């Protein structure tokens, strides 16, 4: 298949060009909503934790894939291991609210607390990059607080992604990046 390379119009040659046959493909595993819909661990702070998806480590599956979207939307789920009661507060709340129990507060129940939280930002959508490095403080899902938080996991629900950005694999020093693969 020859074409004008300067154009940018996508070109997709197939094996039929030399007598082959294109097969069937099932791409459920690369569906955006599906792939981001799983828990990812984040290292927490002792007490006040602002819920911010950018805390996800950039090399993790969720962290890397989220960063390939410049704008995104999603509801949220958190699983938290904590001592004492856990209090959540919405986007825009005064930090002082974290100590008042009428704001969604989950009483301790071993071994952890799982909660479904709604998108709560004033923007129609959030971003992973903002040309204004550092993101506006309004880019968050509220905050939580407990006597001590030991584990914090995020899970994106109903995710939507806009405008793809670079996604980098590891750069090998050798001809191939070799890893020990699970084997009996």
């Amino acid at each position: 298949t020859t074409s004008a390379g300067e154009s940018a119009d996508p070109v997709t040659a197939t094996v039929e060009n030399y007598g082959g046959e294109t097969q069937v493909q099932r791409r459920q595993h690369t569906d955006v909503s599906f792939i981001l819909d799983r828990f990812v661990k984040v290292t927490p702070k002792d007490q006040i934790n602002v819920l911010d998806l950018m805390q996800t480590p950039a090399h993790t599956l969720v962290g890397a894939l989220l960063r390939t979207a410049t704008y995104y939307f999603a509801d949220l789920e958190v699983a938290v291991k904590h001592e004492g009661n856990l209090t959540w507060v919405p986007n825009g709340a005064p930090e002082t609210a974290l100590d008042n129990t009428t704001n969604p507060t989950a009483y301790h129940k071993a071994p952890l607390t799982r909660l479904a939280l709604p998108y709560t930002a004033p923007h129609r959508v959030l971003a992973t990059a903002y040309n204004g490095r550092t993101l506006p403080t309004s880019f968050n899902y509220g905050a939580i607080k407990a006597t001590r938080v030991t584990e914090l996991l995020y899970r994106m629900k109903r995710a939507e992604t806009y405008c793809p950005r670079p996604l980098l694999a590891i750069h090998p020093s050798e001809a191939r990046h070799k890893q020990k693969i699970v084997a009996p």
Binding site: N103, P104, T105, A106, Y107, P111, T113, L115
Partner: peptide, 11 residues
């Protein structure tokens, strides 16, 4: 199920 059932002040 773990993670469910605790009292939530606004449930």
């Amino acid at each position: 199920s773990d993670g469910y059932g605790g009292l939530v002040t606004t449930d």
